Amino acid sequence: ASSNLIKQLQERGLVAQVTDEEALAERLAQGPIALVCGFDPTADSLHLGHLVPLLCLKRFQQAGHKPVALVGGATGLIGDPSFKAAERKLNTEETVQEWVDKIRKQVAPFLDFDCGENSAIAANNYDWFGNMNVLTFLRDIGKHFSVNQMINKEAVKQRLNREDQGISFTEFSYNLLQGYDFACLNKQYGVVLCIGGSDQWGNITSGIDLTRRLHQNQVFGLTVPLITKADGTKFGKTEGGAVWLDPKKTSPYKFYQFWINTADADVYRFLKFFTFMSIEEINALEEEDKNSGKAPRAQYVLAEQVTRLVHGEEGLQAAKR
Amino acid sequence: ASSNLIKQLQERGLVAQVTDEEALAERLAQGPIALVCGFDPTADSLHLGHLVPLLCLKRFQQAGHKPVALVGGATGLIGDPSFKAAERKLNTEETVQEWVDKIRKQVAPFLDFDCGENSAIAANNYDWFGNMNVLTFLRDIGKHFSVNQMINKEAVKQRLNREDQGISFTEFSYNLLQGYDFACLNKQYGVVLCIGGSDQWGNITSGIDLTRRLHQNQVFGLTVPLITKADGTKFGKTEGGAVWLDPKKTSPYKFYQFWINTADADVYRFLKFFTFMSIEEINALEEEDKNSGKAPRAQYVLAEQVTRLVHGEEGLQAAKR
Ligand SMILES: N[C@@H](Cc1ccc(O)cc1)C(=O)O
Ligand SMILES: N[C@@H](Cc1ccc(O)cc1)C(=O)O
């Protein structure tokens, strides 16, 4: 009884929030849809913080849907303030342009760009913002945004009720750029769903509302949960900084080691978030570790699964030498 | 004892607010400065609501300063929300472009464009916003604006504490456009003072702050009072709408009639706001009307003075036929 995709992702604990779940589930049953997940070039590589949303894009593709991997060539020149305590550093056009190509190439191996009509599409919002006049933006896009609504958006609320956290007009405008990305992708590729990290709810719903206002099309949003560790410490954060997906920044060996170090309380949940093993197999593995008087083998399984996903068979082998 | 320009305008009741009056008065004594007053093309003509600021630009020129008359080819495509209850209507590029030339030509006769180094300059902010990329605006200008500060700006405060008054991102951004106009004019023409209507304080101070942030130059602002009538009704507002400065919209005859109709309680104050008669002469005229047992002749004087200023000798003559 293949209940449905949203339900199956829910079992994995991968659905934080979703707009009109009933309507989305029916839409998904109608046929393959185009969906999008965006990634901003805040560095020359993505890191573990972007992995769950990325693999989730792959889960949709495996269910027959078409993933659009958007790299923020323009949004990365603005900076997303969503649930951020401080103003992000402004990078130069030259540097972000370079980071954009690096990230695009890093994302490609994760998706299938050669499987028929549901083949993946790489997008860059610099295509439409890169040369958009400011008056056009303020009028054609800005007229549809209520500042009253924008200021009580949870993602930036804390930055407004400050005494230690302010927000520039630059980052405050980010919500309109991402909102228009949704409308623009709906118009050109028929994208009707946008998924993203948990801090992306307000940016996504702005896109839903603007697509309705501009094109009169109903689209949807779904956010994945922010990954947490039972010990309350920050996931993907180590003494040496982030765990990068780039083998030249974080070696496959070090990556494999990061996963081996997973706590017992997190490992089964992590198997669900980061791998494609069935729920049935993960539960059986949990039971197996419970009844064996052996070291749990879940950490080894997780490390093996994610390392291969991220660095392929070659990376997995480099992890043992 | 030519005390000083700010003082003399104060005697006329023409100074609503001024930034660092002491510092401005000393700067004015140093020599002729370039100053600016802007006008947005919200119609194909200016009206009585723009007259006081316009003549004030002329008062500065007569004191030896250089007036820059800025017409908002770009700002008129956005709309100033300052102390406005509702969102302004968005006009098309074609229409505003046309209104811009009409207004520029209407303003010219009021200023001297042929008197040496203090000759007037006509400016249009469409020159710098017309083709400015949105990313450039948001980054190079937007980074210097605190949204926390923008939202408690008096000019838009009421639009935020609503239940009957909201504000679009479009009009909320207007403050940055006008603020940059000041910085841009300071950089190219050395403009160090901006004057404007009373509702312009926050737009002007944003320009002062941004000029400091961008060019590290100290500039000043001065607003003229919003004209009021003793009977509490709206000045420049009639049954037929606005009193236009365009003779084809409001005939010189009708214009002269508007002034003749001035109430006794307003006429002496209006002589100060709208004419170049000395304060001494206006006071003597008030005394004369007080002691004559004749109809006051102040209304006739006012009508004659302003009609000539706005429509010249030809207009004045057309007012008697
Ligand atoms: N704002 C998203 C990335 C993103 C960028 C542009 C988009 O259109 C969508 C998503 C993030 O910070 O993860
Ligand atoms: N905002 C002013 C007009 C103006 C426009 C642009 C400026 O740079 C300055 C002033 C008004 O509404 O009267």
Side-chain angles (χ1 to χ4, degrees):
Chain A
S2 182
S3 52
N4 237 196
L5 192 54
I6 309 304
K7 246 62 157 305
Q8 301 161 346
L9 291 171
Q10 271 159 170
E11 324 179 14
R12 295 224 162 217
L14 287 177
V15 180
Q17 301 174 81
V18 52
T19 60
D20 205 329
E21 177 182 354
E22 178 187 72
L24 175 55
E26 290 180 8
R27 181 59 186 83
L28 294 172
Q30 283 175 55
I33 62 160
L35 64 151
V36 62
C37 184
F39 306 92
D40 267 2
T42 177
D44 61 345
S45 170
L46 296 182
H47 55 71
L48 288 185
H50 310 86
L51 192 57
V52 169
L54 222 205
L55 303 176
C56 204
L57 204 55
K58 185 167 177 67
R59 295 174 198 287
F60 271 86
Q61 185 172 47
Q62 287 183 343
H65 304 291
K66 185 187 180 77
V68 175
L70 174 69
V71 178
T75 41
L77 285 167
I78 297 309
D80 186 353
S82 304
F83 293 92
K84 254 73 65 171
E87 192 76 20
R88 309 181 116 167
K89 181 180 176 176
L90 288 172
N91 289 294
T92 69
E93 288 253 356
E94 297 66 44
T95 292
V96 175
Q97 176 217 302
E98 197 70 356
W99 292 355
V100 168
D101 258 75
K102 286 196 183 70
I103 292 175
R104 186 193 80 272
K105 302 163 73 164
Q106 181 177 79
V107 163
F110 286 91
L111 307 177
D112 192 347
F113 285 80
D114 185 23
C115 59
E117 285 58 38
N118 80 319
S119 288
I121 282 185
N124 180 352
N125 50 22
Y126 196 85
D127 288 10
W128 49 93
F129 284 123
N131 60 38
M132 182 185 284
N133 178 267
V134 65
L135 292 174
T136 296
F137 173 80
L138 293 176
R139 288 159 60 78
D140 301 349
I141 292 165
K143 73 201 287 185
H144 303 292
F145 284 77
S146 166
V147 172
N148 307 251
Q149 298 184 186
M150 291 178 73
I151 63 185
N152 34 54
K153 209 80 173 180
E154 208 62 44
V156 298
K157 198 177 176 184
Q158 61 164 175
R159 298 279 286 274
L160 285 314
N161 307 314
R162 35 79 85 167
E163 53 263 293
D164 72 309
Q165 287 189 178
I167 185 171
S168 63
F169 180 91
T170 310
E171 291 191 354
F172 184 68
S173 308
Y174 188 102
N175 185 73
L176 281 64
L177 303 177
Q178 175 161 346
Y180 182 65
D181 282 350
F182 203 160
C184 183
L185 290 172
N186 172 67
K187 181 184 64 195
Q188 71 200 313
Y189 302 123
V191 167
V192 300
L193 169 65
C194 176
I195 71 172
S198 184
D199 61 324
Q200 294 302 299
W201 184 254
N203 284 339
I204 289 169
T205 58
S206 277
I208 290 180
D209 297 345
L210 179 68
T211 297
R212 171 185 61 69
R213 281 158 202 146
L214 277 282
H215 310 309
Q216 296 74 60
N217 296 145
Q218 179 187 190
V219 297
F220 309 81
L222 179 155
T223 55
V224 295
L226 250 49
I227 315 303
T228 65
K229 296 201 286 178
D231 78 358
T233 61
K234 182 183 177 61
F235 172 74
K237 160 194 167 184
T238 66
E239 324 69 13
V243 184
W244 306 100
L245 304 191
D246 186 337
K248 301 166 176 295
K249 294 178 76 75
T250 296
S251 66
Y253 186 101
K254 178 156 152 43
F255 189 81
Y256 183 95
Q257 291 296 139
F258 164 83
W259 291 109
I260 283 298
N261 189 43
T262 305
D264 292 339
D266 302 320
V267 78
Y268 302 100
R269 281 170 35 236
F270 284 6
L271 282 167
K272 299 179 186 181
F273 297 159
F274 299 96
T275 79
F276 289 80
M277 292 172 59
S278 69
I279 235 65
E280 297 71 35
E281 179 170 31
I282 292 177
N283 291 331
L285 175 56
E286 184 171 11
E287 189 58 33
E288 176 198 337
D289 286 345
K290 239 192 296 185
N291 301 311
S292 78
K294 301 176 181 180
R297 77 178 174 86
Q299 280 81 355
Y300 163 68
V301 176
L302 181 63
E304 178 188 357
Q305 295 279 295
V306 190
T307 295
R308 182 186 293 118
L309 278 175
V310 176
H311 300 294
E313 271 303 317
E314 303 179 17
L316 183 54
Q317 235 300 56
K320 318 306 180 58
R321 59 182 57 160
Chain B
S2 182
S3 52
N4 237 196
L5 192 54
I6 309 304
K7 246 62 157 305
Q8 301 161 346
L9 291 171
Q10 271 159 170
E11 324 179 14
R12 295 224 162 217
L14 287 177
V15 180
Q17 301 174 81
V18 52
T19 60
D20 205 329
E21 177 182 354
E22 178 187 72
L24 175 55
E26 290 180 8
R27 181 59 186 83
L28 294 172
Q30 283 175 55
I33 62 160
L35 64 151
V36 62
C37 184
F39 306 92
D40 267 2
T42 177
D44 61 345
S45 170
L46 296 182
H47 55 71
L48 288 185
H50 310 86
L51 192 57
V52 169
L54 222 205
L55 303 176
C56 204
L57 204 55
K58 185 167 177 67
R59 295 174 198 287
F60 271 86
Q61 185 172 47
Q62 287 183 343
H65 304 291
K66 185 187 180 77
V68 175
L70 174 69
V71 178
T75 41
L77 285 167
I78 297 309
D80 186 353
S82 304
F83 293 92
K84 254 73 65 171
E87 192 76 20
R88 309 181 116 167
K89 181 180 176 176
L90 288 172
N91 289 294
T92 69
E93 288 253 356
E94 297 66 44
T95 292
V96 175
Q97 176 217 302
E98 197 70 356
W99 292 355
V100 168
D101 258 75
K102 286 196 183 70
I103 292 175
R104 186 193 80 272
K105 302 163 73 164
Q106 181 177 79
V107 163
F110 286 91
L111 307 177
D112 192 347
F113 285 80
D114 185 23
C115 59
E117 285 58 38
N118 80 319
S119 288
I121 282 185
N124 180 352
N125 50 22
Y126 196 85
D127 288 10
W128 49 93
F129 284 123
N131 60 38
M132 182 185 284
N133 178 267
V134 65
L135 292 174
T136 296
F137 173 80
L138 293 176
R139 288 159 60 78
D140 301 349
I141 292 165
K143 73 201 287 185
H144 303 292
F145 284 77
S146 166
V147 172
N148 307 251
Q149 298 184 186
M150 291 178 73
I151 63 185
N152 34 54
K153 209 80 173 180
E154 208 62 44
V156 298
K157 198 177 176 184
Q158 61 164 175
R159 298 279 286 274
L160 285 314
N161 307 314
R162 35 79 85 167
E163 53 263 293
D164 72 309
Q165 287 189 178
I167 185 171
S168 63
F169 180 91
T170 310
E171 291 191 354
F172 184 68
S173 308
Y174 188 102
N175 185 73
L176 281 64
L177 303 177
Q178 175 161 346
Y180 182 65
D181 282 350
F182 203 160
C184 183
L185 290 172
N186 172 67
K187 181 184 64 195
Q188 71 200 313
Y189 302 123
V191 167
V192 300
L193 169 65
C194 176
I195 71 172
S198 184
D199 61 324
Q200 294 302 299
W201 184 254
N203 284 339
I204 289 169
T205 58
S206 277
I208 290 180
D209 297 345
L210 179 68
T211 297
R212 171 185 61 69
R213 281 158 202 146
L214 277 282
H215 310 309
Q216 296 74 60
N217 296 145
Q218 179 187 190
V219 297
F220 309 81
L222 179 155
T223 55
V224 295
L226 250 49
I227 315 303
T228 65
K229 296 201 286 178
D231 78 358
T233 61
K234 182 183 177 61
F235 172 74
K237 160 194 167 184
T238 66
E239 324 69 13
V243 184
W244 306 100
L245 304 191
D246 186 337
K248 301 166 176 295
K249 294 178 76 75
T250 296
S251 66
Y253 186 101
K254 178 156 152 43
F255 189 81
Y256 183 95
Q257 291 296 139
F258 164 83
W259 291 109
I260 283 298
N261 189 43
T262 305
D264 292 339
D266 302 320
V267 78
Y268 302 100
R269 281 170 35 236
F270 284 6
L271 282 167
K272 299 179 186 181
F273 297 159
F274 299 96
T275 79
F276 289 80
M277 292 172 59
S278 69
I279 235 65
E280 297 71 35
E281 179 170 31
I282 292 177
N283 291 331
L285 175 56
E286 184 171 11
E287 189 58 33
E288 176 198 337
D289 286 345
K290 239 192 296 185
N291 301 311
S292 78
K294 301 176 181 180
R297 77 178 174 86
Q299 280 81 355
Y300 163 68
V301 176
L302 181 63
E304 178 188 357
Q305 295 279 295
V306 190
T307 295
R308 182 186 293 118
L309 278 175
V310 176
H311 300 294
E313 271 303 317
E314 303 179 17
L316 183 54
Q317 235 300 56
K320 318 306 180 58
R321 59 182 57 160

